[PDB]
Design a binder for this molecule. Structure first.
Ligand SMILES: *Cc1cc2c(cc1C)nc1c(=O)[nH]c(=O)nc-1n2C[C@H](O)[C@H](O)[C@H](O)COP(=O)(O)OP(=O)(O)OC[C@H]1O[C@@H](n2cnc3c(N)ncnc32)[C@H](O)[C@@H]1O
Ligand SMILES: *Cc1cc2c(cc1C)nc1c(=O)[nH]c(=O)nc-1n2C[C@H](O)[C@H](O)[C@H](O)COP(=O)(O)OP(=O)(O)OC[C@H]1O[C@@H](n2cnc3c(N)ncnc32)[C@H](O)[C@@H]1O
Ligand SMILES: C=CCc1ccc(O)c(OC)c1
Ligand SMILES: C=CCc1ccc(O)c(OC)c1
Lengths: 519, 519
C-alpha cells in the first residue's frame, strides 16, 4: 500500500531529506503518510500498486524555499516532482513517473506580481489559478481577458509549461509566455530574456532578450523549476459573437476540415476554435442512461435521438468572432459561406439555442476566458469515472482528421468505451484529444484502458502521428515514438539533462528524460 | 596582414583540418589566402588588424558534409563560424569574433525543399535568399507573401536565427519558425518538433512536438549548426493599403508612442510598422551635400528645409492595412483618429505622394514582402560609409522612446554623425535600431565610432536598456550587461555550451558564449 523508496535512496537519506525540507518550509508543509492521498493520481490506470507512488510532498512558499529544497535533494539524492498546482488530471494529476519521488507542490506560491492593462500581461507565481487571475482582473476593473483551459482550477504557469491550450485568440498558452524565473537543478536562480538585465522594464514586453532563447527548454521538461512566469493577455475586444455550426454525418469531418484550413491559416477563425464529437458535447448536460440502457458504446439510433433532443450534430464546430462589428460581419460571411452547402449543416448563435443548460451557452463563456468547472460533467457519462487523454497531432487536412477519427473511435468502442473527441484548431495543426472515460476503481476496466491506450499510441505512430502531451504512465512510450535517426533528439535531451542536473534529482522520467544515474 | 592561428591550435593541426575539409567538400570549396576577402567584415571598426580575422572558409553542399566538417573540427580543435549566407552587414558580415576561426559557409546549401500554399509554409536550407524564395513563389504562382528585412540578399534561415525583423504581420522572423534540422557540435544530426517522428506530415505545422522545446537555443547561439528550417508564410490577403503619417517635431515621438501602444497591443496595427527619423528616411533619396556643405551633423534649419522639400517629418510612421476593404476601413479609422489631433500631423497614401522616387512608394514594396537592395542608399548620406546597428529594446512608452532618442541622438551628433533612428514596432516592444554611418576606411572615424558605441551600450545599460542584437566586436560587452544575479544566465549558457560542445569548436564568442577551453 505505502510508496516504496526510490531505487538507490536509503531510508536514512530519505529521512534526512524530509527533516531538512521541514526546516525549510515548516513541519506543517511536509506531507508523508495519510496526508499523501491528494498527490496520488486520481484517475488510476496501473493495477500495480507500486507504480507512480509519491513518497511525500513538500509545499514551499518562496523561490528561496524552492532553491533550498533543490540543494537538499542534490545532497541526499532524493528526486523531486515539481508541480505548479498539480491539477494535471487525465495525465497523472500530481503523481510522479517514478515511485519514491517527492512532489514539490508550489500551490502556496500564489502571488500575482503584476497585471498590466496598458501592455496586456500578467507576471504570476505557479500557484496562481485561472479563477484567481480572473477574479483579480474583475476586482481591479482591468480591461483584459485571460485564456482558460476547460477547468479553471489549473495553474496559469503549469498548464502553459505542459503546452496546454484554451479557446480564445490567446489559446496557445506557452506561445503567450514572456519572461520566466527558473530554479536550475543545482539550486541557482536565473531570469530569462530581458529579466537578465538589472533594472529592466521589458521582462514581460520582449521574449528573446539576447543570446540563446531558452524559455522553451523548461516546458514539458525536468531541466528546472519555474518560479515566476510572464504571460501576454488579450485586451478586451470591441465585440464578441460566439457561434456553433453542427454537422449531421460522422464522415462530414473530412470536408469540414478541408474548409477550416484556409480560414485558420489566414486567421479568419481568430481563436483556438474546436470541433467536438456528439458524445463529448452531449455528456456536458446528459448521461448515457437517459438515452440507452445498454453497457456498450451507443448505437446509431441513440446518437441520432441525442442529436435531435439536444440540437447537436455528430460534429459540433464552436468558435467566436472578436472585434468591431464590421470586422466580425466580414469574418462571419467568410466562415458561414465555407460550410453553407454541406447537407445537414445548421448554424446557431446563442439566441438560437432552445435549452437553458446548453453546449453553446457554456462554451460562449470559455471562448471569452471565463474560468468554470462545467467540463467535469462528461465524467458522469457512464455513471462516474476517470479519464485519460490520448492527444495526437494532425495536419488541418480532411484525410488525416477522418483517418484519426476512424482509427481512434473504432478502437475505443471495441474496448467498450464511447468515443469523445476534440479537434482543437491551432495555427496550422489540430490537437486531436480523445478523452476516454472509464471506471478507475475497477481493475478490469483499468486493464482494458491500459491495453487500448498502448494500441492507440502504436497505431498512431505507425501512421506517422505523434502525441503532443501524455500521462505519466506513457511518457517513456511517447518519447520512443520520436525516434528519428536512432532516438537522436532524446540523446540530445539526455546530454542537456546530465549537464544541468548531474544528480538527476528533477522529475526523473518527465517526457521520457531520466538522466545518467537512472538510464 | 594574414589572420593568426587561433590560440591553442598549431600550424600542423590547422593544416591537417584544412586538408580533411578539402576531402569532404572538394578542394575548390576550401578558401584560404586571397579567397578569404569576402569573409572579412566589410564595415571595419577595430584599428587592430589582428581582430575578427577568419583563417579560412569551407563551403559545404550537404548536411553530411556539415557533419564531417564538425567531426574534423573536434579532432583538431579548429573552431568554426557557421553562417547561412553571411550577409550580417552592420553586425560583422561573415567575420568571426575570434581571429583564426574558420567560417563554415552554407551558401551552397540553397535547396527550397517545399513551399506549401494551402498550409502557408516553406522548408528551406540556409543558403536560400529572400530573392530566391520570392522568385520561386512568383514563378509557381503561389498565393503567399514572404516577410523581408530591408536587404533581400540575406538568408531566410540566418536572419531568423539572429532574431531578425521585417515589415509585414510575419515580421518577427524567429517567431514564424517551425521545425529545424541541427548538426550538434559532436557532428550528430537531430530534427526538432514533429521532425523527430519518422514518417510525420507535421514538421512545419506544429512547433513543439513533445518534450522540451529547444528550437530557440539554436538562435543567437553556438549550440549547433542549423541545416534546414521551416517558416510560416502569410496567405496573400484580399487587400493591402500602405500609409505614411509624418510628425513635425522631434518631441512628437513621446505622444506618438503613447498612441501606438494600444493600437499595437490589440493588433489594430497589423504589421511590424516603423517610426523612422527624418535623416534615415531622407537618405533613401538625397545626400547631406544636397542641403548642407558643413562637416558634421545637420543643424535645425537644414532639417526644416529637408522636411518641406521631401514631405517628411522629424518622425515618419510607415505601416500598412491588410485584408478585405471593410476590415482595412475599420482599422484605418482607429489609426487615423489616434493621431489626428497632433499639431502638424500629415497623412499620406501612395497616390498622395508628389515625388516619383519616394520613401512611401519604396516601403509599400517592403511591407508586402518584396525583396530589394535600396536600403543601402542611406550609406551615401555623408559621402559613402559603412554602418553599425546600436539596437536597444524599449517599452512602447513615450517616456522611454523620447529618453532613448535624446540619449542616442545627442551622443551620435556629438561624435560627428547624423542620428538615423528606427523604432520597429513588435508585439509589446520597440526595437530601437540606430544605424551609425561612418567612414570605415578612416582609422580616426573608426576610433570615434568605437568610443561612441561603448558609451551608447554603457549609458543604455545604466538606464536598464539592453540590446536585442549586436556586432561581433561587442558580443562580450552586451552579454556582460545581462548580469542579473552575478551573470546567472551566462553561467547556465556556459553549462549547456560545455555539455553540447566540450571541445568549444562552434563559434567561440557568439553572444559572449566561449566554452571552458577559452573563458
Ligand atoms: C480531465 C480533464 C483534463 C483537462 C480538461 C478537461 C478535463 C475534464 N480540459 C483541458 C483543456 O481544455 N486544456 C488543457 O490544456 N488541459 C485540459 N485538461 C488537462 C489538465 O487537467 C489541465 O491542463 C490542467 O490545467 C493541468 O494542471 P495544472 O494547470 O495544475 O498544471 P500542473 O499539474 O501544475 O503542471 C503540469 C506538469 O507540468 C510540469 N510543471 C508544472 N509546473 C512546473 C514548474 N513550475 N516547474 C517545472 N515543471 C512544472 C510538471 O511536469 C507537471 O506535472
Ligand atoms: C546595413 C544594413 C543591415 C540591415 C538592414 C539594413 C541595412 C542597410 N535591415 C535589416 C532589417 O530590416 N532587418 C534585419 O533583421 N536586419 C537588417 N539588417 C542587418 C543584416 O544585414 C540582415 O539582418 C541580414 O539579413 C543578416 O545576414 P544573413 O541573413 O545572411 O544571415 P547570416 O549572416 O547567415 O547569419 C547571422 C548570424 O546568425 C548565426 N547563424 C546563421 N546561420 C546559422 C546556422 N545555420 N546555424 C547556426 N548559426 C547560424 C551566425 O552567428 C551568423 O553570424
Ligand atoms: C474535453 C477535453 C479537453 C482537453 C483538451 C486538451 C487536453 O490536453 C486534454 O487532456 C486530457 C483535455
Ligand atoms: C534601416 C535599418 C534596418 C535595420 C533593422 C534591424 C536591424 O537589426 C538592423 O541592424 C543594423 C537594421
Amino acid at each position: 500500500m505505502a510508496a516504496p523508496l526510490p531505487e538507490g535512496v536509503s531510508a536514512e537519506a530519505m529521512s534526512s531529506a524530509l527533516d531538512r525540507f521541514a526546516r525549510i518550509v515548516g513541519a506543517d508543509w511536509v506531507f508523508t503518510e495519510d496526508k499523501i492521498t491528494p498527490y496520488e493520481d486520481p484517475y488510476t490506470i496501473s493495477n500495480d500498486e507500486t507504480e507512480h507512488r509519491p513518497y511525500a510532498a513538500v509545499a514551499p512558499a518562496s523561490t528561496e524555499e524552492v532553491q533550498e529544497i533543490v540543494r537538499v535533494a542534490n545532497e541526499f539524492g532524493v528526486p523531486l516532482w515539481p508541480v505548479s498546482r498539480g491539477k494535471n488530471f487525465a495525465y497523472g494529476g500530481a503523481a510522479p513517473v517514478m515511485s519514491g519521488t517527492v512532489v514539490l507542490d508550489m500551490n502556496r506560491m500564489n502571488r500575482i506580481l503584476e497585471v498590466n492593462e496598458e501592455f496586456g500581461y500578467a507576471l504570476v507565481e505557479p500557484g496562481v489559478s485561472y479563477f484567481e487571475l480572473y477574479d483579480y482582473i474583475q476586482e481591479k476593473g482591468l480591461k483584459l481577458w485571460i485564456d482558460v483551459p476547460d477547468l479553471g482550477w489549473g495553474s496559469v504557469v503549469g498548464n502553459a509549461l505542459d503546452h496546454g491550450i484554451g479557446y480564445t485568440p490567446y489559446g496557445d498558452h506557452f506561445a503567450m509566455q514572456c519572461g520566466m524565473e527558473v530554479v536550475l537543478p543545482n539550486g541557482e536562480v536565473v531570469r530569462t530574456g530581458m529579466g537578465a538585465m538589472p533594472g529592466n522594464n521589458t521582462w514581460q514586453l520582449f521574449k528573446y532578450g539576447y543570446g540563446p532563447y531558452v524559455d522553451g527548454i523548461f516546458s514539458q521538461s525536468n531541466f528546472g523549476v519555474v518560479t515566476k512566469m510572464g504571460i501576454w493577455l488579450m485586451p478586451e475586444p470591441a465585440g464578441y459573437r460566439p457561434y456553433l455550426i453542427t454537422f449531421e454525418n460522422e464522415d462530414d469531418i473530412e470536408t469540414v476540415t478541408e474548409r477550416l484550413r484556409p480560414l485558420k491559416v489566414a486567421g479568419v477563425i481568430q481563436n483556438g476554435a474546436t470541433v467536438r464529437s456528439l458524445v463529448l458535447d452531449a455528456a456536458i448536460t446528459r448521461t448515457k442512461s437517459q438515452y440507452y440502457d445498454g453497457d456498450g458504446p451507443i448505437p446509431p439510433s441513440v446518437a441520432k435521438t441525442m442529436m435531435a433532443d439536444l440540437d447537436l450534430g455528430m460534429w459540433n464546430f464552436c468558435g467566436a468572432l472578436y472585434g468591431p462589428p464590421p470586422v466580425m460581419d466580414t469574418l462571419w460571411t467568410a466562415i458561414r459561406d465555407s460550410f453553407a452547402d454541406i447537407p445537414g449543416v445548421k448554424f446557431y448563435f446563442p439566441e438560437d439555442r432552445r435549452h437553458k443548460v446548453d453546449l453553446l451557452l457554456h462554451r460562449a463563456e470559455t471562448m471569452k476566458g471565463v474560468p468554470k468547472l462545467t467540463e467535469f460533467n462528461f465524467l458522469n457519462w457512464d455513471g462516474g469515472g476517470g479519464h485519460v487523454g490520448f492527444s495526437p497531432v494532425s495536419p488541418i487536412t480532411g484525410k488525416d482528421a477522418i483517418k484519426q477519427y476512424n482509427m481512434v473511435s473504432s478502437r475505443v468502442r471495441e474496448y467498450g468505451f464511447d468515443y469523445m473527441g476534440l479537434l482543437a484548431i491551432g495555427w496550422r495543426d489540430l490537437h486531436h484529444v480523445t478523452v476516454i472515460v472509464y471506471d478507475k476503481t475497477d481493475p478490469d476496466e483499468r486493464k482494458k484502458l491500459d491495453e487500448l491506450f498502448n494500441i492507440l499510441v502504436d497505431e498512431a505512430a505507425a501512421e506517422g502521428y505523434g502525441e503532443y502531451r501524455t500521462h505519466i504512465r506513457y511518457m517513456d512510450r511517447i518519447a520512443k515514438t520520436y525516434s528519428w535517426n536512432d532516438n537522436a533528439l532524446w540523446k540530445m535531451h539526455e546530454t542537456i539533462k546530465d549537464a544541468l542536473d548531474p544528480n538527476g534529482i528533477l522529475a526523473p522520467g518527465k517526457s521520457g528524460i531520466w538522466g545518467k544515474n537512472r538510464r
